[PDB]
Design a protein around this ligand. Structure first.
Ligand code: TCH
Lengths: 129, 258, 256, 256, 129
């Protein structure tokens, strides 16, 4: 949550990460940090929208947009299995049409490949928990 | 302006017949493919079109060595992502116009296909159709580049055997000038397709081709991160009083990726 | 006495707009393109959309714009040249059953038409082509080059003839079927007889109309953008806060 | 003023490639074939494929190659001759309902195009024909003979014009239907007007392009290949080790 | 382009054409017109005594072609855009200071003081900001 930027006052800051079409959740990248912990023993997961090498590789080559989202296509580099299909919205975050209840983790040894530009209303194929 | 230089190295009658371009490969491709008639109208500098002759070079050094292709034109190296094939000749200009005090001669040969690559000593670069040009010549030296070939067309992937154009420092570079400096004649290479160059078969234009010269990121070297310790970069510099050939292990990568 | 046949229903009519004939005495060059780029219909970069049964009539399924960013060959060639002028020709394919029952209406909205929001009765007032989602064959349109200026520059902040597509009657299944059956569509484009570019420059820079490319970096070989540690997983979770307000690791796709 | 009809959508265009006109001054002979082999569409040896609902868009359903191994008559005749040159013509038939809703796109990939893996946006950049799985009539293509050499040898380690087919939009049923309903396809081929062989040899040997034939031996009249005893049964079992690493009784179909 | 040797005698003459999207241009609104860009192609190789260091100078001089024209006579305006910056004809001793309300008593250079100050009075842009 937003820390204290002023001492008690309001500041300028980026807008919330939205909005989504009905049925889409936020694809999260997950890393675990170092934590001082008196009682618990689990890992403190922090979540980001895009990792580095994506925030670089942007602002180094400046692309245009031409539409409201990019339809990516995550597939594993071995056997060419298609893991899922996501929408990289033009505001630098990935939406993924998942209608389950709990989490659903994917393997991290595939490569995102841009397929096309898709409008805001495009309807992704559901993923299966 | 002064004409105590060499007027023009007008292309000698190099011993070579005329070679057919797109007239042989036309009834064997299933498309009618033409390229902009304005690309044939000006000489633009090659991608590999910059060399230099210093006086530390010796007779025999290979100044430039560039195979006939579409890699000889920024225009056609870009158009050759959409096609799979090409045929035809090119016309190359060689711009060395060194000082009035320099002296020396380069020899530009026309190496055929399948000739073994490697040494190409100075005793044998003259056995090819060649042009011996002084490094003081004023006006550019137009010299051809024929598509001597065994097949109808070449595929736009560099494993082709195609006619090279080797240039070799024939006599060394010296200067009469009375003061404490030897000039470094720096030549350039300009090129334009001949009258019957042609590409063959429109294909999806893919960026990751054998052409597409290296690009670097537009990021300042002070926002970059270090490759040997987790910190920013606080200044690039050149120091001659250090280990000159170090054996570091991190941040060491070929340009071709590995 | 005549017969008025009760089935033709199509073929949008045009009046030929001049291409290089207006641009010629004011451009430095007029640069032809390959005569075989006019022969094939290749898929638009934005050639993707879907019609779901939860779309209401009026929704604008796509909204293109006459440029050279409608054809992967002209988006490539348009890095050597500084501006274009000429017509184009589009066709769309729709992949639906004999169960889905809707009609879409592809309209040719001129430039400088006030960009607000068209209704369903105003879309059929343009040169349009009406087509349902059960057609097997692709349907095509001429995207002409109505313009005020003599030629366009390949830096697209200029207005050009749009191609708007609206869901005209709601998509609903002749059968009970499924409520998650989306009708995928695709667009495909090619120059018409009167397209040509203007002024040869070098392949300028990266470009615009350059398609986004992502680094070939498996996410486990990446770095988290809110902590100095490698990426240790991918997930999706509806239970966590839906719209967080992170501040680090945020970036547009245009680099800002 | 014109009319641009809103439905043609097909007919791939060609420029005629020369057949025996290039090969003639360098071949010893130029051997015609029966004038009635050009009249019928007979089924390719590899003329078999299926499109299941578990195929993802991008999958390459088949990938042929212009040869004489695309027609059971030219695969036979090509045992007397030493090399061929000429065009061909393919047609495919697809057997789908009015429930299945996909589109495949059959492309003509040239030779020496880097054999990696085409995406879905790059397949429509070749001379292609787009067709959905609900068509009743078979659709056809000209498979031309783009080549660098003057003629090909019937020992196929030479590159020739391929015919690649990709699943363009995913196969999904307008109805709930079944998830195991496969759309069978078939290929059928015939020479075009410009096919002919080169140099009469004897019917050379067994051959290549010779179709695999299995011995007429009922399995009970066989011998086990890991023990000197007759075969005493056939079965399938998912409970046993799926991928054993046997060493005896293993052999390719090319004999190694 | 045109590739000119440094040791040419007579001045290189070349055109500057009016490539445009519109019929004419408006004089009171800088727009996009054709540029001449000059670049150093190969470097300069000469001797140099000890001072000066022999720079090769060059100067561009233009005139209207045979078909230059203006369009529509308006009444002349004084606040145009091709109006060179003129300065007040006032000696500095008669001026007034900008940071302290007093006359100005001496203008001088001084390499000793902070070479890059951050004053906040007497800051202006020559374009009037
Ligand atoms: C030590 C890690 C937990 C503590 C932590 O989150 N950070 C400590 C330093 S840092 O901030 O990661 O820089 C644990 C939790 C996540 C673990 C990792 C994860 O379990 C993923 C793989 C799993 C492999 O079996 C082992 C390596 C590994 C890559 C693990 C390495 C390491 O044991 C990790 C990183």
């Amino acid at each position: 949550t937003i820390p204290e930027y002023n001492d008690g006052l309001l500041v300028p800051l980026a807008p919330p990460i939205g909005p989504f079409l009905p049925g889409e959740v936020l694809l999260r990248f997950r890393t675990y940090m170092r934590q001082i912990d008196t009682a618990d023993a689990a890992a403190e997961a922090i979540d980001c929208a895009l990792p580095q090498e994506f925030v670089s590789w942007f602002a180094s080559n400046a692309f245009t947009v031409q539409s409201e989202a990019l339809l990516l296509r995550y597939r594993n580099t071995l056997t060419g299995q298609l893991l899922f299909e996501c929408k990289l919205y033009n505001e630098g975050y990935i939406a993924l049409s998942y209608s389950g209840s709990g989490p659903l983790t994917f393997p991290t040894d595939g490569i995102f490949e841009v397929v096309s530009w898709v409008p805001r209303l495009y309807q992704l194929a559901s993923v299966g928990s | 302006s002064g004409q105590d230089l060499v007027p023009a190295a007008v292309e000698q009658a190099v011993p070579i017949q005329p070679v057919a371009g797109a007239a042989l490969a036309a009834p064997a491709a299933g498309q009618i493919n033409q390229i902009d008639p304005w690309i044939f109208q000006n000489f633009v500098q090659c991608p590999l079109g910059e060399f230099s002759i210093s006086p530390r070079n010796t007779p025999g050094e290979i100044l430039f060595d560039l195979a006939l292709g579409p890699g000889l034109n920024p225009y056609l190296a870009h158009l050759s992502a959409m096609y799979t094939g090409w045929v035809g000749n090119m016309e190359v200009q060689l711009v060395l116009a060194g000082n009035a005090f320099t002296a020396g001669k380069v020899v530009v040969a026309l190496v055929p296909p399948y000739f073994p690559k490697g040494s190409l000593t100075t005793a044998q670069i003259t056995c090819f159709p060649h042009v011996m040009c002084d490094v003081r010549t004023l006006e550019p030296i137009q010299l051809p580049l024929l598509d001597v070939r065994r097949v109808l067309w070449h595929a736009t992937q560099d494993q082709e055997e195609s006619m090279r154009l080797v240039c070799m420092l024939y006599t060394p570079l010296r200067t009469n000038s009375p003061g404490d400096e030897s000039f470094v004649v720096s030549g350039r290479l300009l090129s334009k397709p001949a009258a019957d160059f042609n590409f063959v078969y429109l294909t999806p234009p893919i960026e990751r081709t054998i052409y597409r010269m290296v690009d670097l990121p537009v990021i300042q070297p002070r926002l970059c991160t270090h490759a040997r310790w987790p910190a920013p970069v606080y200044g690039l510099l050149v120091d001659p009083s250090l280990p000159s050939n170090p054996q570091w292990q991190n941040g060491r990568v070929h340009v071709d990726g590995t």
